[PDB]
Amino acid sequence: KVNQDGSRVLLRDVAKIELGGENYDIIAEFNGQPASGLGIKLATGANALDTAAAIRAELAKMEPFFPSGLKIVYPYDTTPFVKISIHEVVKTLVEAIILVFLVMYLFLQNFRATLIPTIAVPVVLLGTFAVLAAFGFSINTLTMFGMVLAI
């Protein structure tokens, strides 16, 4: 508005104008240091591991254009557990083979005879994986323990 003496009244005079947060309700602090990240949540029926993999895939092209100082950090994450779970289970698989092999040799002196079993279950396991997929099933924690067990 403009008062009688043609004195203009700019908003700049009745309110402090500034570019700021849209909502000051939550503040994130990464190790006592000011920050803010992205807390991803899946969708009913997501592929989780596949998602997170892509989350980093999409958020990968942004790194090339970040501003001075703006760096990324990975708090509360899952990936390492999924990968470690596999590596571990698969490891047990190997160990199970090398062990049954010995227990085989200590009974079937014939180094040649002690090869059938060692070459028996492999073809069997692979078949399982092939059958699981044939049913949509995937390399799940359970579907794996079943392998190790069934072994």
Partner: protein, 150 residues
């Protein structure tokens, strides 16, 4: 809006207009004094979330026209719950320092708009908020000139 208002101004309207959705176990409602409601519908195990969502959110369309205009122009969503995060890409700054708000904005303006679409990301959470033209009024001044927020 307060817990009371939203509960029977934005909530109840929806709930009532919420019925006739193939498969459904129950419907819980939370009206936070923060002026934010969040109705949830859990469908029988096995129900295709895709079609389910379509339904539960196309009846809301029959409710929308009866919600406070402030709300209608506000944020209305319908997603697939997961009550649990995973990939939590936290962002900070070292060199050219920038307020814990200067960052929030950036992330929500180059990353969040993306991720919230990337590989079936059920729901992305932005710990903070994107910028906005904030105009903090001052009673006195407004009066010292005979003016109201209006």
């Amino acid at each position: 809006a307060d817990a009371k208002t939203v509960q029977d101004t934005v909530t109840q309207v929806i709930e009532q207009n919420m019925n006739g959705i193939d498969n459904l176990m129950y419907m819980s409602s939370n009206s936070d004094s923060t002026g934010t409601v969040q109705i949830t519908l859990t469908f029988e195990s096995g129900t295709d979330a895709d079609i389910a969502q379509v339904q539960v959110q196309n009846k809301l369309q029959l409710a929308m026209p009866l919600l406070p205009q402030e709300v209608q122009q506000q944020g209305v969503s319908v997603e697939k719950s997961s009550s649990s995060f995973l990939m939590v890409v936290g962002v900070i700054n070292t060199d050219g320092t920038m307020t814990q708000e200067d960052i929030s904005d950036y992330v929500a303006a180059n990353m969040k708009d993306a991720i919230s679409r990337t590989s079936g990301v059920g729901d992305v959470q932005l710990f903070g908020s994107q910028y906005a033209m904030r105009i903090w009024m001052n009673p006195n001044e407004l009066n010292k000139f005979q003016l109201t927020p209006v």
